[PDB]
Design an enzyme around this catalytic site. Sequence first.
Site, PDB file in Angstrom:
ATOM      1  N   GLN A  19       0.870  -1.370   0.041  1.00 35.73           N
ATOM      2  CA  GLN A  19      -0.110   0.009   0.069  1.00 35.73           C
ATOM      3  C   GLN A  19       0.856   1.166  -0.070  1.00 35.73           C
ATOM      4  O   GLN A  19       0.207   2.417  -0.234  1.00 35.73           O
ATOM      5  CB  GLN A  19      -0.821  -0.170   1.359  1.00 35.73           C
ATOM      6  CG  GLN A  19      -0.053   0.089   2.658  1.00 35.73           C
ATOM      7  CD  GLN A  19      -0.969  -0.057   3.577  1.00 35.73           C
ATOM      8  OE1 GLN A  19      -1.261  -1.360   3.842  1.00 35.73           O
ATOM      9  NE2 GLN A  19      -1.432   0.926   4.284  1.00 35.73           N
ATOM     10  N   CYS A  25      -5.195   0.689   3.603  1.00 37.13           N
ATOM     11  CA  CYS A  25      -5.184  -0.872   4.038  1.00 37.13           C
ATOM     12  C   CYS A  25      -6.672  -1.497   3.843  1.00 37.13           C
ATOM     13  O   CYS A  25      -6.591  -2.469   3.521  1.00 37.13           O
ATOM     14  CB  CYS A  25      -4.664  -1.022   5.353  1.00 37.13           C
ATOM     15  SG  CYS A  25      -5.490   0.140   6.537  1.00 37.13           S
ATOM     16  N   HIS A 159      -5.752  -1.076  11.703  1.00 38.08           N
ATOM     17  CA  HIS A 159      -4.953  -1.457  10.252  1.00 38.08           C
ATOM     18  C   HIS A 159      -5.919  -2.811   9.947  1.00 38.08           C
ATOM     19  O   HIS A 159      -6.039  -3.472  10.675  1.00 38.08           O
ATOM     20  CB  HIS A 159      -3.519  -1.989  10.725  1.00 38.08           C
ATOM     21  CG  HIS A 159      -2.850  -2.219   9.358  1.00 38.08           C
ATOM     22  ND1 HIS A 159      -2.638  -1.552   8.251  1.00 38.08           N
ATOM     23  CD2 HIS A 159      -2.240  -3.595   9.063  1.00 38.08           C
ATOM     24  CE1 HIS A 159      -1.926  -1.824   7.202  1.00 38.08           C
ATOM     25  NE2 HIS A 159      -1.631  -3.176   7.598  1.00 38.08           N
ATOM     26  N   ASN A 175      -0.902  -9.282   4.842  1.00 39.39           N
ATOM     27  CA  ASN A 175      -0.764  -7.941   5.101  1.00 39.39           C
ATOM     28  C   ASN A 175      -0.573  -7.185   3.704  1.00 39.39           C
ATOM     29  O   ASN A 175      -0.064  -7.746   2.697  1.00 39.39           O
ATOM     30  CB  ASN A 175       0.404  -7.871   5.921  1.00 39.39           C
ATOM     31  CG  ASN A 175       0.357  -6.285   6.689  1.00 39.39           C
ATOM     32  OD1 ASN A 175      -0.592  -5.438   6.289  1.00 39.39           O
ATOM     33  ND2 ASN A 175       1.104  -5.971   7.541  1.00 39.39           N
TER      34      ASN A 175
HETATM   35  C1  LIG Z   1      -4.949   1.523   7.396  1.00 46.41           C
HETATM   36  C2  LIG Z   1      -3.482   1.657   6.714  1.00 46.41           C
HETATM   37  O1  LIG Z   1      -3.706   1.917   5.460  1.00 46.41           O
HETATM   38  O2  LIG Z   1      -2.497   1.187   7.266  1.00 46.41           O
HETATM   39  C3  LIG Z   1      -5.717   2.909   7.567  1.00 46.41           C
HETATM   40  O3  LIG Z   1      -4.897   3.889   8.229  1.00 46.41           O
HETATM   41  C4  LIG Z   1      -7.147   2.825   7.925  1.00 46.41           C
HETATM   42  O4  LIG Z   1      -8.044   2.605   7.058  1.00 46.41           O
HETATM   43  N1  LIG Z   1      -7.760   2.735   9.248  1.00 46.41           N
HETATM   44  C5  LIG Z   1      -8.563   2.457   9.656  1.00 46.41           C
HETATM   45  C6  LIG Z   1      -8.732   1.468  10.839  1.00 46.41           C
HETATM   46  C7  LIG Z   1      -9.648   0.454  10.831  1.00 46.41           C
HETATM   47  C8  LIG Z   1      -9.094  -0.740  11.752  1.00 46.41           C
HETATM   48  C9  LIG Z   1      -9.677   0.009   9.423  1.00 46.41           C
HETATM   49  C10 LIG Z   1      -9.248   3.861  10.033  1.00 46.41           C
HETATM   50  O5  LIG Z   1      -8.905   4.683  10.703  1.00 46.41           O
HETATM   51  N2  LIG Z   1     -10.563   3.953   9.558  1.00 46.41           N
HETATM   52  C11 LIG Z   1     -11.451   5.213   9.890  1.00 46.41           C
HETATM   53  C12 LIG Z   1     -11.268   6.260   8.875  1.00 46.41           C
HETATM   54  C13 LIG Z   1     -11.305   7.550   9.264  1.00 46.41           C
HETATM   55  C14 LIG Z   1      -9.978   8.327   9.278  1.00 46.41           C
HETATM   56  N3  LIG Z   1      -9.779   9.312   8.446  1.00 46.41           N
HETATM   57  C15 LIG Z   1     -10.550  10.510   8.343  1.00 46.41           C
HETATM   58  N4  LIG Z   1     -10.144  11.297   7.558  1.00 46.41           N
HETATM   59  N5  LIG Z   1     -11.531  10.757   9.121  1.00 46.41           N
END
Ligand SMILES: *[C@@H](C(=O)O)[C@H](O)C(=O)N[C@@H](CC(C)C)C(=O)NCCCCNC(N)=[NH2+]
Length: 212
Positions: A19, A25, A159, A175
């Site tokens: 990525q 992710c 993640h 991953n």
């Molecule tokens: C994951 C990565 O690429 O490593 C990426 O940071 C991600 O999608 N994180 C998720 C966590 C979940 C467990 C999937 C996340 O933060 N999702 C919510 C998105 C909201 C954050 N961003 C904004 N602009 N509000």
Amino acid sequence: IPEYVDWRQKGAVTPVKNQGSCGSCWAFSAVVTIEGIIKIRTGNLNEYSEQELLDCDRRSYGCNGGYPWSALQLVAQYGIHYRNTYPYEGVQRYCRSREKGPYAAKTDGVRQVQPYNEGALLYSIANQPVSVVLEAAGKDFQLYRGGIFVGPCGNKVDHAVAAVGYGPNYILIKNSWGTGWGENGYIRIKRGTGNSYGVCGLYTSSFYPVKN
Ligand SMILES: *[C@@H](C(=O)O)[C@H](O)C(=O)N[C@@H](CC(C)C)C(=O)NCCCCNC(N)=[NH2+]
């Protein structure tokens, strides 16, 4: 369900992706589960477009993160293009789904695994690759090179990755950090520890696509 599952041996897992710096992710994880369910249902292994989900999933936030469940719901409502048609660019761009022709694959919905339940997640993996989330921020996970990972890690999941198999004491995780991380891009995470969260919060939020 059997003692060992490894969707790689059933030809249902494409090569490991990277990525990059982009927080995409969630789209990579979702795409892994789509490639898997399309192989399981149709017999053909194809690569699908993470970039399409990055650009077009209006509920997620592009490279600022997102939701594997919104990405799977987008593929169930519209569809998804082949990775060749809509390649990964590592940056959010305009949604280009209409300009790239008919979708290549489409699913019929999204089911959530019962959270905080190891057997429920194992059951879903015995049927198909599953989108799961975990805490990857700790150095120990970041620096993982191989073996059955036991931590240290907390349960503050951040993640999205994909569970593509399991064994008696581990769950097999694809991953999206390239083939140089972990076990050729994979990690085996200890299971059976009795912590309801799962190692690294692995049981927090798990989704898989449904395709009849
Ligand atoms: C994951 C990565 O690429 O490593 C990426 O940071 C991600 O999608 N994180 C998720 C966590 C979940 C467990 C999937 C996340 O933060 N999702 C919510 C998105 C909201 C954050 N961003 C904004 N602009 N509000």
